[PDB]
Amino acid sequence: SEVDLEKKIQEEYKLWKQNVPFLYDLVITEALEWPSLTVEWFPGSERSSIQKLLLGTQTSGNDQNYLQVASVQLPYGLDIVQKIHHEGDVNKARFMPQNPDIIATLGLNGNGYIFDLNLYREQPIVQTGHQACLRHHTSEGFGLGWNFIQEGTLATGTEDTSICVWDIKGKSLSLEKSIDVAPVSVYHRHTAVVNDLQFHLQHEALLTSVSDDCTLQIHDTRLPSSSSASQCVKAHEQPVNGVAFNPFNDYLLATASADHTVALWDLRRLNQRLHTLEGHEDEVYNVQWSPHDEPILVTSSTDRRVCVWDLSKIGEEQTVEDSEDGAPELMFMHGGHTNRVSDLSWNPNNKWVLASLADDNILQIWSPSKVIWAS
């Protein structure tokens, strides 16, 4: 029960601190005023470097929401250095890979938003707010993604079950006015909320999506909504919460699901799943590939755990004592969070550094000891 539950929750929490100096080379912990459902490291660092994180607020109507830029002290604190005004909770927020100055958000009531940070470099607080509002959705969502080959093109996915594809390239933004933007495409191919979508890293038109309708689908954004999804397979028997393309292997991808597991997939054989990562004991909401090492990925869940997985170690055998503890591929389990985990982000500047968000206002920037990952 809940009361019984909490006591258990901490008591092992501070057992976790006790254990930290052996397990982590780094652990930064911040309590935020409001929660954040979204985190993403900015590329680049200044000089012991200092780096930047994209963040948001979840006021729930109670106060004004903020898209936030925070800076961290990395080899130890971190502070919020910019707050831009935001319509509704920042459901998720991602920078343009071509230009991290450009930010896309999914805001209140399904609205897309575009922020230009170059417009307000010096200001601590930007009240002006967004530079553009992406029109179409009618419920709120979390599926947001940017196109790596086509500058200025992005996809959104929502509880309204649609997927919209937008093109903001060439559209002037200014502190004068917020332009309205209409989708270039609108795809109805799901029967429930589109939970996550993502553009393929090395292909202009390939867009993958997953949903509560248990499907993994593959869309060719060149074809009009008149067409169907290029591929649609059942991926799990329960809702699929997340999808990630491997940044080194063009055909390898992963799905996180409410079945407590992560499935891995070869793109050209979506009819028979390659492998299943068990080991979470509640819904697996999120899944992310290391940008540094192809066999490495990370999963977070409602079981308040974050798991780091090494796929080299599959088809590998070991003592029963370890079988008690998990698969040979489970490398690291972060226990730093005392509530379900909202979002994660691999640090692209520093190998083996991760940011993670919990629903009880905690931000953590941590790194598993070098013992455990280098061999």
Partner: peptide, 13 residues
Amino acid sequence: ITKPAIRRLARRG
């Protein structure tokens, strides 16, 4: 504590 015990502690959480 020692490297093996560390590497399994990483897996029990």
